[PDB]
Structure 1
Amino acid sequence: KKKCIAKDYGRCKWGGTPCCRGRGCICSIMGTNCECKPRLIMEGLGLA
């Protein structure tokens, strides 16, 4: 699976380059500041 950004926190876009290592291109929920973070999913607002 080539064509991606294996750079942790690698600026990426949902319509441009994805992440290699397996990061998730998370943005600022506004359409700006998109980046590929090292798979992060820590909830709690619903757990507590």
Structure 2
Amino acid sequence: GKKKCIAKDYGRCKWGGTPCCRGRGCICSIMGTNCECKPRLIMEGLGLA
């Protein structure tokens, strides 16, 4: 029961810190502070990246 990851589910997430059970889309702003967990993957479309 999330007892192996986090409870935030989405939003504040850090690959090197606060894990992200659901939504691996953990990206931060240019400054690297607005690290939010999004459900969307790396592909900003279909499979171009």
* CA-based RMSD: 3.6
Q: Distance in 2 between matches of 1:17 and 1:27?
A: 13
Identity %: 100
1:19-40 CA distance string (max 9 Å, x none)? 1123321111331110111124
Alignment TM-score, normalising by the size of structure 2:
0.50
Change (3 A) 1:47 1:24: closer
CA distance in 2, matches of 1:42, 1:23: 12
Distance 2:40 2:15 in 1: 15
TM-score norm. by structure 1 comes to: 0.51
Counterparts of 1:16 and 1:47, CA distance in 2 = 29
Q: CA deviation at 1:7?
A: 4.0
Instruction: Tell me how many residue pairs correspond in the alignment.
Output: 48
